């Protein structure tokens, strides 16, 4: 059937804001995250701290267009921004010394989004 899209007004507003931000700063990462967030709910991105530890380097910035879960173990110091955090994932990141923030805070900190890596 038809793809209605997210029912969350906050998520729709965030998608629109990301598109506008990409337009303003002449970058494509925010539009990419916008459509990745737009993908159907049953296919929404799912990531684990194990994968983040596997592929992310210390001090790097990570954006997950979806949910981040606390399956595995983490050592890296990584700034991860995701729509939703499980309590275990957030606690593991905090213990490892990273930061669990939202795409809004990520945009504020790095408006050009340089060096940010997308994980799905």
């Amino acid at each position: 059937m038809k793809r209605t899209g997210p029912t969350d007004p906050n998520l729709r507003r965030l998608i629109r804001y990301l598109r506008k931000k990409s337009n303003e700063y002449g970058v494509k990462i925010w539009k990419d995250v916008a459509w990745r967030l737009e993908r159907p709910r049953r296919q929404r991105a799912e990531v684990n701290v194990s994968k983040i530890n596997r592929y992310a380097n210390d001090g790097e910035m990570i954006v997950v267009p979806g949910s981040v879960l606390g399956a595995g173990k983490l050592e890296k110091k990584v700034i991860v921004a995701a729509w939703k955090f499980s309590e275990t994932a957030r606690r593991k990141i905090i213990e490892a010394g990273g930061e669990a923030i939202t795409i809004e805070e990520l945009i504020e900190r790095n408006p050009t989004g340089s060096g940010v890596r997308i994980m799905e």
Partner: protein, 147 residues
Amino acid sequence: MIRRRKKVRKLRGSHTHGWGCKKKHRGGGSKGGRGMAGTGKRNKSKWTWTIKYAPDHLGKRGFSRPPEVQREVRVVNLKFIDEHLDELMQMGIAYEEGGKIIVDVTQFADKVLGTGKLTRPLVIKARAFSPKAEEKIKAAGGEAVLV
């Protein structure tokens, strides 16, 4: 959070409701046999479907032992133990009792499998251990107490 109307509301004026010619949608003859009939034993109306999407629908296979004598052997992995050690510490399954760190996997799970890796030197105590699990524990430097 999304709700929709039924297709019948849209099909109200269809005059067929998407069933094609008015002759179809009558009964057992329209289905080619009620229920699971025609699957191969005597009637081959659905033999072509059976031989592809439901193999071994007709026939027999080996035996099953009585459930009473079938003993259950719960299995746990080194990966699980290492990943959930802290929770075991909270629950009391794991403690120190000296310099070494003891974990009693006898309360839950009866056999330890060797999936994954071992990082820190522990001492697990179980009933049975896989050769890979024993080798990995010894390499990591822990002790595998056969109790």
